[PDB]
Ligand binder design. Structure first.
Ligand SMILES: CC(=O)Nc1cc(Nc2cc(NC3CC3)n3ncc(C#N)c3n2)ccc1[C@H]1C[C@@H]1CN
Length: 328
């Protein structure tokens, strides 16, 4: 028989309650600005789907970030644009400032004075991790409440201007609208941030996917172990998770949802006990690890997506008490 269906624990019907124009991105008509308003200054990077530059808006002397797309499905282009426009003004979500035609579109973004990822992560105190985790959660609770899952939460998609304690969750190119009963593509996210639902080919996933990704980020930060789950491929990625979370809870999860496991998996998963978080603790990371951090980490990293904390529940955790107190 087939797998057991699933529904998001929260914000289940937020898109059902909205007019179809809000989420029917295939019918979206792109609003184009003037390409002559922007002059590229320098290259920032490149990927499979884009080339990114720093640019100057010559009408107001504003520094921007220009993402020139490579050949991508028109509906996937419309998807990223629509999600960005729906999330405009949301806390800690990057602003899409404009859209111009380069052949291909170029999305124009708000510029964040990003602190060098490796220079930043080796200076972060216990308070900073808690502070920035809290800021990512504001962005996640917001996009989830607006019926959207990011599906690509990882450190490189988080811009931090540390001097101004400013955080922006970027790159909404893999983001989707959540619809109860919809089966989504599992070939999403970066290997090391892939949820067990993706790895076992469970398609009826939801916002809880971003919470697993967040757990991966938190683990790498507090233990100073990047990446935390270091798989050699998608099959071995699950083996690395099972070596920490144990195979017992993994098979209970497979059983609960009636998941047909790939014959390849049978021989490589083996049998593993659930490890204690204390084995990743050493003299170089102990200042970042506390009983509160571990309790919060355990509640994020669950095989069963329905038993992971929501972004709102995560914000009420004791790990954030001093951050919440200081913000008032
Ligand atoms: C725009 C986006 O989604 N792609 C992407 C982003 C950056 N780099 C930067 C750098 C900064 N600021 C630092 C001072 C220069 N900022 N500030 C705001 C944004 C945005 N959005 C931003 N992007 C570099 C490379 C990529 C893409 C090609 C690679 C594929 N993964």
């Amino acid at each position: 028989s087939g797998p057991v269906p699933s529904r998001a624990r929260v914000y289940t019907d937020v898109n059902t309650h909205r007019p179809r124009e809000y989420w029917d991105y295939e019918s979206h008509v792109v609003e184009w600005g003037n390409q002559d308003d922007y002059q590229l200054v320098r290259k920032l990077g490149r990927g499979k789907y884009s080339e990114v530059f720093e640019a100057i808006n010559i009408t107001n002397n504003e520094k921007v970030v220009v993402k020139i797309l490579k050949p991508v499905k028109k509906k996937k282009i419309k998807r990223e644009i629509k999600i960005l426009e729906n999330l405009r003004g949301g806390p800690n979500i990057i602003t899409l400032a404009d859209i111009v035609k380069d052949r291909t579109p170029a999305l124009v973004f708000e510029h964040v004075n990003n602190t060098d990822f490796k220079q930043l992560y080796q200076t972060l105190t216990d308070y900073d991790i808690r502070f920035y985790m809290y800021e990512i959660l504001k962005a996640l609770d917001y996009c989830h409440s607006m019926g959207i899952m990011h599906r690509d939460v990882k450190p490189h998609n988080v811009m931090i201007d540390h001097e101004h304690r400013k955080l922006r969750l970027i790159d909404w190119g893999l983001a989707e609208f959540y619809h109860p009963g919809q089966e989504y593509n599992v070939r999403v996210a970066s290997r090391y941030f892939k949820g067990p639902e993706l790895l076992v080919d469970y398609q009826m996933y939801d916002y809880s996917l971003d919470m697993w990704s967040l757990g991966c980020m938190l683990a790498s930060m507090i233990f100073r172990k990047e990446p935390f789950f270091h798989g050699h491929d998608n099959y071995d990625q699950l083996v690395r998770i099972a070596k920490v979370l144990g195979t017992e809870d993994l098979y209970d999860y497979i059983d609960k949802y009636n998941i047909e496991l790939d014959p390849r998996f049978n021989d490589i998963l083996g049998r593993h006990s659930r490890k204690r978080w204390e084995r990743f603790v050493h003299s170089e990371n102990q200042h970042l690890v506390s009983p509160e951090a571990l309790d919060f980490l355990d509640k994020l990293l669950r095989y069963d997506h329905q038993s992971r904390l929501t972004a709102r529940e995560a914000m009420e955790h004791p790990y954030f008490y001093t951050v919440v107190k200081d913000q008032a």
